[PDB]
């Protein structure tokens, strides 16, 4: 395992998220079920070619990293929430994760470095 991994992500928050508000939406009103339905819709359009992950990230991700096309930069273990951290280190460089759940909401992760 490397010391750190760099990753990009797309976060779809929901009304039960730790902070139910984002740069793009004042009050998150969508349900956990609708958030996972959107996440899976994004995964399927990214797998087919219909959409670009970093483009979707800048447009719809509820994390402020959206302005940097989803990029979170590099991080070591002991920093991010354990579900996100484990999925990220498990990914090969250039590999994308499926749905990943954390208290912030639901994520799709892309390891870049």
Curated annotation (Swiss-Prot):
Subcellular location, record wording: Nucleus; Nucleus speckle; Cytoplasm
Keyword terms, alphabetized: Acetylation, Cell cycle, Cytoplasm, Isomerase, Nucleus, Phosphoprotein, Rotamase
Expression sites (tissue/organ): Expressed in immune cells in the lung (at protein level). The phosphorylated form at Ser-21 is expressed in normal breast tissue cells but not in breast cancer cells.
Residues modified as Phosphoserine: 21, 58
GO cellular component: ciliary basal body; cytoplasm; cytosol; glutamatergic synapse; midbody; nuclear speck; nucleoplasm; nucleus
Limits of the PpiC domain: 2-113
EC class of the enzyme, as a word: isomerase
Catalytic reaction annotation: [protein]-peptidylproline (omega=180) = [protein]-peptidylproline (omega=0)
EC number(s) stated in the UniProt entry for this protein: 5.2.1.8
Single Gene Ontology MF annotation: phosphoserine residue binding
One of the GO BP terms on file: regulation of gene expression
Post-translational modification: Phosphorylation at Ser-21 by DAPK1 results in inhibition of its catalytic activity, nuclear localization, and its ability to induce centrosome amplification, chromosome instability and cell transformation. Ser-21 is dephosphorylated upon IL33-stimulation of dendritic cells.
Chief location of this protein within or outside the cell: nucleus
Organism superkingdom: Eukaryota
Domain-level remarks: The WW domain is required for the interaction with STIL and KIF20B.
Protein's job: Peptidyl-prolyl cis/trans isomerase (PPIase) that binds to and isomerizes specific phosphorylated Ser/Thr-Pro (pSer/Thr-Pro) motifs. By inducing conformational changes in a subset of phosphorylated proteins, acts as a molecular switch in multiple cellular processes. Displays a preference for acidic residues located N-terminally to the proline bond to be isomerized. Regulates mitosis presumably by interacting with NIMA and attenuating its mitosis-promoting activity. Down-regulates kinase activity of BTK.
Subunit structure: Interacts with STIL. Interacts with KIF20B. Interacts with NEK6. Interacts (via WW domain) with PRKX. Interacts with BTK. Interacts (via PpiC domain) with DAPK1. Interacts with the phosphorylated form of RAF1. Interacts (via WW domain) with ATCAY; upon NGF stimulation. Interacts with PML (isoform PML-4). Interacts with BCL6. Interacts with FBXW7, disrupting FBXW7 dimerization and promoting FBXW7 autoubiquitination and degradation. Directly interacts with RBBP8/CtIP; this interaction depends upon RBBP8 phosphorylation.
Name recorded for this polypeptide: Peptidyl-prolyl cis-trans isomerase NIMA-interacting 1
Organism for this UniProt entry: Homo sapiens
Gene: PIN1
Parent-record interval covered: 51 to 163 of 163
């Amino acid at each position: 395992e490397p010391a750190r991994v760099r990753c990009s992500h797309l976060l779809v928050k929901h009304s039960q998220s730790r902070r139910p508000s984002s740069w793009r939406q004042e009050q998150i009103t969508r349900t956990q079920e609708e958030a996972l339905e959107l996440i899976n819709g994004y995964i399927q359009k990214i797998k087919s070619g219909e959409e670009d992950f970093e483009s979707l990230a800048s447009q719809f991700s509820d994390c402020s990293s959206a302005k940097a096309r989803g990029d979170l930069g590099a991080f070591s273990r002991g920093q991010m929430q354990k579900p996100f951290e484990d999925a990220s280190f498990a990914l090969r460089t250039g590999e994308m994760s499926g749905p990943v759940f954390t208290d912030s909401g639901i994520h799709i992760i892309l390891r870049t470095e």
